[PDB]
Ligand SMILES: C=CCNc1nc(C[C@@H](C)C(=O)NO)c2cc(Cl)ccc2n1
Ligand SMILES: [Zn+2]
């Protein structure tokens with residue numbers, strides 16, 4: 518059964534609601550981005566209109582084999598009409614192709630659905646500027662003040678510097694980056710760029726990246742593993758055992774692995790600083806867990822909400838317990854009282 522926060526009242530619209538079979542009276546299924554917790558249910562057998570970004574549609578066609586006649590890509594930052602309702606897609610600053618959706622309801626109500634997003638001040642100079650928003654469907658993944666983490670730029674700075682130093686000190690070192698789905702591509706792209714190398718990866722991951730409209734991507738990635746000194750592996754293989762096995766392959770070409778495990782928030786964030794992160798080490802293998810987030814920190818979320826001044830907030834994450842729902846409402850009221858809306 519499709520939960521309430523996935524329906525747009527007054528429309529035939531659902532958002533990220535593909536695992537509930539046919540939704541009665543849904544005329545258009547919006548997909549904010551291509552992460553499995555959101556497209557769960559979509560497959561080659563889906564027979565209803567799917568509205569999404571261009572990049573999301575490339576992945577639907579190529580990775581899930583959805584039929585083109587059901588894929589409706591929409592440009593960003595453009596007033597479009599879907600089943601008689603004006604809609605706009607806005608960059609969510611999440612993973613490639615991820616959008617927020619603005620709905621202009623016939624009764625004059627305006628709804629912003631953030632999908633998943635990492636709130637940024639640049640969003641305050643999008644089409645949202647001076648737009649009254651009556652309801653906000655808010656990605657509340659990290660809606661609590663202990664969720665602090667550095668900017669994405671700071672994490673990439675640390676990763677680039679760490680990789681460049683280890684490979685400059687040891688030209689026979691190999692850099693490995695773990696990946697689980699799309700997003701966070703800058704970690705391995707930026708490392709490879711500073712090392713003057715391409716990124717080696719499986720055919721399946723190569724295929725996925727070829728859907729992301731990344732400029733000059735053919736110059737950056739390859740399936741030729743052993744011509745590259747940055748390798749991508751499934752996130753589950755980023756452990757001493759999995760990396761020891763990866764070191765045997767490619768035949769005594771490398772004598773050291775430095776590996777990066779991009780996480781979200783972890784408890785050691787409210788304790789250490791990004792410059793102070795140290796790896797787990799076993800022999801010639803080191804594993805760095807780096808807090809690269811594509812979700813808003815608490816402070817980023819609070820700033821965006823206080824700027825937008827929505828009349829009502831519907832959280833879309835952490836809604837499962839009485840404690841989590843009421844804590845989030847308490848923060849929403851605090852923000853409203855502090856900002857005056
Ligand atoms: C804790 C942080 C986010 N939480 C989360 N993240 C993901 C994938 C990430 C990449 C995403 O941003 N997805 O939208 C999940 C994937 C599945 Cl399959 C199930 C639960 C999931 N929870
Ligand atoms: Zn996501």
Ligand SMILES: [Zn+2]
Pocket residue numbers: 552554555633
């Ligand atoms: Zn998500």
